């Protein structure tokens, strides 16, 4: 059993509930965590 057009599955309305909460905020739970995590890595230890 399958639907017709765009897009499935899915799943209107899940363009802003499934593909933005664990997809765009993934670029936040690791990308923004890198902002504070890297502030003590770039100097350890390229400058010995």
């Amino acid at each position: 059993a399958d639907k017709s057009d765009l897009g499935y599955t899915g799943l209107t309305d899940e363009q802003a509930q499934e593909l933005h909460s664990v997809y765009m905020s993934g670029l936040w739970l690791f990308s923004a965590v890198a902002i504070v995590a890297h502030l003590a890595v770039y100097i350890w230890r390229p400058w010995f």
Binding site: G7, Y8, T9, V22
Partner: protein, 42 residues
């Protein structure tokens, strides 16, 4: 659309960074002149 949201979105970011970071840890372990406790040796 398509792909996986209740499947391959919490398992495409758990063995993917571990397959890009922790395997990358080995090359900065390939140093023994740097290295974060080998400095005592060199």
């Amino acid at each position: 659309w398509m792909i996986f949201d209740p499947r391959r979105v919490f398992v495409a970011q758990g063995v993917f960074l571990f397959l890009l970071a922790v395997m990358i840890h080995l090359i900065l372990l390939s140093t023994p002149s740097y290295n974060w406790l080998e400095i005592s040796a060199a």
